[PDB]
Symmetry: D3
Subunit: 151 residues, 6 copies
Amino acid sequence: ANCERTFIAIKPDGVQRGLVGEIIKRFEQKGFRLVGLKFMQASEDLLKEHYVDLKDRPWFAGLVKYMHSGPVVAMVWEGLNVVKTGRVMLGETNPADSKPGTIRGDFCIQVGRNIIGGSDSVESAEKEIGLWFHPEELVDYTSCAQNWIYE
Amino acid sequence: ANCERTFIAIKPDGVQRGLVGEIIKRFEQKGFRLVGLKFMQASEDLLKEHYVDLKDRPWFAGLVKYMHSGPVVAMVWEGLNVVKTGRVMLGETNPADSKPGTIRGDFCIQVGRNIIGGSDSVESAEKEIGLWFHPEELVDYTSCAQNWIYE
Amino acid sequence: ANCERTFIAIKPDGVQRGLVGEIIKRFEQKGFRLVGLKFMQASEDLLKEHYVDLKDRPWFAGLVKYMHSGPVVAMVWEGLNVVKTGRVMLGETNPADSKPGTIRGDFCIQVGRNIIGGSDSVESAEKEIGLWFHPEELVDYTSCAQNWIYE
Amino acid sequence: ANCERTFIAIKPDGVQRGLVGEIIKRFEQKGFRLVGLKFMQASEDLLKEHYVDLKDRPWFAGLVKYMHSGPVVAMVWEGLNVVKTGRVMLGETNPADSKPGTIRGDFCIQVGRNIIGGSDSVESAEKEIGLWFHPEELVDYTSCAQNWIYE
Amino acid sequence: ANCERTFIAIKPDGVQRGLVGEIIKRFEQKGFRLVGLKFMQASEDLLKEHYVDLKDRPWFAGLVKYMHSGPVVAMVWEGLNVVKTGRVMLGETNPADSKPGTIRGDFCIQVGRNIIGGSDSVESAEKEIGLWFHPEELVDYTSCAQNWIYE
Amino acid sequence: ANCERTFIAIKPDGVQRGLVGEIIKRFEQKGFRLVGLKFMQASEDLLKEHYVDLKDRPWFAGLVKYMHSGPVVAMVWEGLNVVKTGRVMLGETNPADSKPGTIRGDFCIQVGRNIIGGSDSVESAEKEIGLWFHPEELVDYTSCAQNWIYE
Ligand SMILES: Nc1ncnc2c1ncn2[C@@H]1O[C@H](COP(=O)(O)OP(=O)(O)O)[C@@H](O)[C@H]1O
Ligand SMILES: Nc1ncnc2c1ncn2[C@@H]1O[C@H](COP(=O)(O)OP(=O)(O)O)[C@@H](O)[C@H]1O
Ligand SMILES: Nc1ncnc2c1ncn2[C@@H]1O[C@H](COP(=O)(O)OP(=O)(O)O)[C@@H](O)[C@H]1O
Ligand SMILES: Nc1ncnc2c1ncn2[C@@H]1O[C@H](COP(=O)(O)OP(=O)(O)O)[C@@H](O)[C@H]1O
Ligand SMILES: Nc1ncnc2c1ncn2[C@@H]1O[C@H](COP(=O)(O)OP(=O)(O)O)[C@@H](O)[C@H]1O
Ligand SMILES: Nc1ncnc2c1ncn2[C@@H]1O[C@H](COP(=O)(O)OP(=O)(O)O)[C@@H](O)[C@H]1O
Ligand SMILES: [Ca+2]
Ligand SMILES: [Ca+2]
Ligand SMILES: [Ca+2]
Ligand SMILES: [Ca+2]
Ligand SMILES: [Ca+2]
Ligand SMILES: [Ca+2]
Ligand SMILES: [Ca+2]
Ligand SMILES: [Ca+2]
Ligand SMILES: [Ca+2]
Ligand SMILES: [Ca+2]
């Protein structure tokens, strides 16, 4: 049921504070399927383009510097409403406003170090996925539990 | 304290995806007392009797058929306001509306495969408990942590 | 694969200390298939027969009296070499000799309060299974992960 | 970053039910820094002063008597907005109103046995910290993750 | 202390049974640093070369077919004795012989489906890493906890 | 039962890497009773007194210096054979020799940064308990699970 996808990245602090496994586990246990996984050092050009809608924000320059200061984990997840639900799972932009149970709510404190980010919408998702992944990187397969996750 | 009881069932998908232990731990750690526990394949009759209020629903048959497609874990839990809080712990009928931290919110995606279900009123609870369990299958015992869970 | 089965029981102390979910989780994560599951208070007759081989031990009377003092969770698990491996998973008879990582090693201390028990041979398992369960109580189904657990 | 501090105490029932490690783990994983930690049996005088603001509640006598019936784990945690967020992490006063994902929501049921407590304002936190700890008991150090938690 | 590396791959069953997060978490919590992470569909040529030392084994053809039947997660970890210790963490080749606590011991049953594999030695490790990763894929950075993991 | 006690300390690296909760949970879930708990920075004198038997060791100074470099969590735990089993739970002096499932085995790598330590004999235990704790810092209480942990 629905092969909608979404882009999710584990920021540098998430990697530094050893939360990669915990984060990946949350999507797996949820029932979403992993299609892309990459550990890299995103270039500013890549970052600037990814965060184009915020190019004019006072903190923009800081966001790019930070996201570029260390390696990240780029990921792509598939599932019904994965974009909207993914957002719920990460929690509000500001950790202070993220509810316990969400990724940001349980593991971080400051907005400038909120360990993870994702896609805001479907359109944005496809656009972002293409920006980070080459079509030959999105592995396709069927989950042995697909029939128990979807009717 | 309180002797209120509720009926909770781990659905076929819940069993198939290996969430039995996880779900039971949720109730144990909360302080609720396990009263009845049985692994079974619910007969089509039992299920129709159980979901009666949904008989004339545009998907009743698909529901009854699915719940009959595999074994389930039928449970009875005891504790102050267990019925109401049990519902909270489960989350919303639609996993997309269930908050992270809840069972449906953390472990599933679609309403048709929402891994678990439970009584939504003290009246329905007793009714359902009478339908799925024989009185001798409800065990009476006192938790050693009794005085630390209740005033 | 393999349809070998084993009988495993979570003792009264295992239930009292809230370890039911944790224990079930370990057999589920291993790949074993849950076949039977019941919450009950074993009668002294049932217990004396189950432990007949120990009928002449100094501690036999104590074991029976104790195993009858509270409810136990009786289970039947299926899988390749489930009997021998289930034993490895439980740990040694004396928790003091059990290795960290095992059920007894991680969760208990004294031999007389060792939270769990299980068959030690295929022959005994089938005898015990027939002793604690009615044929209709053992459910047959196929794990959606079957092909990924067994070649 | 921020050096705001908060006082949090694991109540007698929290200790009795083996939740000390679990609770500490939640503040550590969030990014907060442990500043003070002591296991003690609070005297009635200390408790009456700590809860002075509730001195006129019908349940005040009961609270004091109860909070004095067993040992508690007193703690001081540091971090940006630790006071307000610590409160969010604990859940609501009445466990029934606490959301899954919160400490009270996940681990307890009744208001009189709600396993944990903490400051509700910066002013109160500093008063309580000074009340329960000696200055030399509050340790100053720098988290190796400092730069990845705070910008 | 020591930048020795090692190659570790999460076989297709490990991916299918949602153990990616759990596995990654075990290396992070251990203290090892992640340098490479890739989700792919290893070609037979790649596989045949990787398993050259077993080219003549009766089950070789089966191993290649299986490892190629689905996507895997290639990884590279750094740390003192990571190759030898990694081996310990995965557990024996045959799950039946893997101790509880190890990855294979806790999560799988059959040798033909032992969810994970790694490098047998340092030399082999470098060789294998080169075979799977392009020098421009092994991200290098320093852990904020490096001084607490090594003297 | 048994009133034997042992001294366990979470080292500076243990605190720095956020393993306090994890470690305490290990002892709580096993059934041991928490007797003393204090967060402190051990003075150089105390440490020399504690590691006396290692004074004339080629790395005594580096040890004493390190243990003084940051706060530690000093603990006293009670239970049948706690000293001996506590050592088992910790693992081997060298993490590379510690089996998965143990604390050192699961969470650290080098002997110089082995996150935890504890008494290795009943004699040393009492000696060390007298060195780190004031008699009033050892709390006496009875676990509600007392009868389910010990015969
Ligand atoms: N007010 C802010 N101050 C600093 N950084 C911010 C602020 N708002 C957003 N950011 C940063 O920009 C990232 C992208 O913003 P946005 O996409 O709007 O939120 P989200 O990542 O939660 O979807 C955030 O994850 C955060 O790191
Ligand atoms: N719109 C729907 N589409 C498919 N299945 C549904 C739908 N609504 C409800 N169901 C199924 O019927 C079950 C019973 O519904 P109901 O009792 O009303 O909600 P709940 O089980 O959450 O209390 C649900 O758990 C779900 O499996
Ligand atoms: N020395 C003993 N003292 C008390 N109880 C014992 C003793 N030895 C064995 N028992 C009890 O008898 C049970 C059955 O023994 P056995 O089946 O031989 O070991 P296991 O339970 O590990 O399969 C044990 O689980 C334990 O509860
Ligand atoms: N109605 C009540 N009955 C019994 N105890 C209560 C009641 N209301 C509050 N308490 C107790 O008083 C404590 C202190 O109250 P308060 O500080 O206002 O809430 P909180 O503990 O959530 O900060 C609560 O944690 C609870 O143990
Ligand atoms: N006897 C066997 N039968 C089937 N498959 C085997 C056998 N021995 C090894 N294999 C497979 O080949 C893989 C590589 O073997 P090897 O590298 O020797 O062991 P390990 O992966 O544990 O290092 C194993 O992980 C397993 O999948
Ligand atoms: N060879 C070594 N090199 C460095 N530090 C060591 C060495 N041997 C021991 N240590 C340190 O000294 C501590 C005390 O040693 P010891 O008490 O003999 O072992 P254990 O603490 O495991 O009981 C160890 O925990 C470790 O931190
Ligand atoms: Ca975004
Ligand atoms: Ca319902
Ligand atoms: Ca009836
Ligand atoms: Ca036995
Ligand atoms: Ca029979
Ligand atoms: Ca308060
Ligand atoms: Ca003071
Ligand atoms: Ca190998
Ligand atoms: Ca020692
Ligand atoms: Ca003294």
